[PDB]
Paper text:
We adopted the Z domain of staphylococcal protein A and its affibody binder dimer complex as a model system. From the structures, we could verify clear compensatory changes between the residues showing the most significant covariations (13A-9B / 17A-31B) in both LL1 and LL2 library mutants.
All mutants except for one (LL2.c1) had a higher fraction of nonpolar BSA than the original dimer (58%), and all mutants except for one (LL2.c7) had a higher packing score (PackStat) than the original dimer (PackStat of Z/ZSPA-1 = 0.640).
Numbering used by the authors:
A (entry chain B): 1 to 57
B (entry chain A): 0 to 56
The structure:
């Protein structure tokens, strides 16, 4: 089966880099994790959003 | 037998390609699929992506 996780990578990664309160190394860490195991896209995006929401001004 | 992982070059290319504001989703997916199949071509693919981003601004 082709899980189409290449497309899942693109959609989730674009969302991660538009989170305004994540710093540069945080975003890059998330992207690296997403690239390596796109099966975890939902877990990673949720962790990134919670962290972004928690780092709000 | 050198093992070229391209860890840095690939992550740089992916991260820049995700920020290019004028690419469409289909274009991003095509670049990421090509990067995953041939990681040695990260520079050529990133340069093509930047050319499209500019031509679509």
């Amino acid at each position: 089966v082709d899980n189409k996780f290449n497309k899942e990578f693109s959609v989730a990664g674009r969302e991660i880099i538009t989170l305004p309160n994540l710093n540069d190394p945080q975003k890059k860490a998330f992207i690296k994790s997403l690239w390596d195991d796109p099966s975890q896209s939902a877990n990673l995006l949720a962790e990134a959003k919670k962290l972004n929401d928690a780092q709000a001004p």
